[PDB]
Amino acid sequence: LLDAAPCEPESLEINKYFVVIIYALVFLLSLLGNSLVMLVILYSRVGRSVTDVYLLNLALADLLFALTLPIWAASKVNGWIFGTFLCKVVSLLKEVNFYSGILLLACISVDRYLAIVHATRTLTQKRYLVKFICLSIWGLSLLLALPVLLFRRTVYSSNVSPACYEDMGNNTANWRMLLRILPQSFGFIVPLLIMLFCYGFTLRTLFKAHMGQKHRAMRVIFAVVLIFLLCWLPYNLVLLADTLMRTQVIQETCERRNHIDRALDATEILGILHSCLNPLIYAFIGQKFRHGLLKILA
């Protein structure tokens, strides 16, 4: 008798306040780290190695993402009251930065694989295309993020407060499912495959080495891979669960809706730390950048 009835989208103020605080703290930390990395790299042009270019681009991407964060914090505070143009611009910038960061992690992994595995051979001469590779990655991210620019507008509803959602048509609900295949395919699967292959073979070659400092290199490689997974796995898992729920593959209940809806925000908050942990994981863990920072202090 009581099976059929409306489901109320539920929320709590504590979550809003917590999200605001976390977003602000992450903004500050990412800004500081990225600014320091850029200052260290650009100050002196001595030894502008490929890794320096890659770290520069990665820091720029993270800095832009952090710059866009605060508007997202306000949106979470009260929904998108900031207008349609800001929705389009902010969404474009956010998606472009996210794609570029992921694909730049992939490219850094490719560089390391071609540097430590194929080190004795002449293939190592093919890693001097950092300019072209970086430009291509930025262009591909830009092209892949245009669906956000074209098909995002403020959406109004009687029970739901404004939010910068998609407007693709009256059957947009299904269309968003197809759109989601992009971030979950060239955003987690391809990058994870490339990183796994590259770092696995790098680990093999290092494990077959008699060097004096194999230990720290292995630790840092494992740290990078585990940090990437810990950062991005939950968001993709929850996204796949949500898509399956909308496909009616998994039985759908109001409480399941609420659970997945809260989990989405929690996982986004956790994942956003990719802009904050990158400077330590990739750059400051090496003696070169610490030495450069100390030298600049004069």
Partner: peptide, 8 residues
Amino acid sequence: AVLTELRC
């Protein structure tokens, strides 16, 4: 209210 994934 607040929502990031609008639903039926």
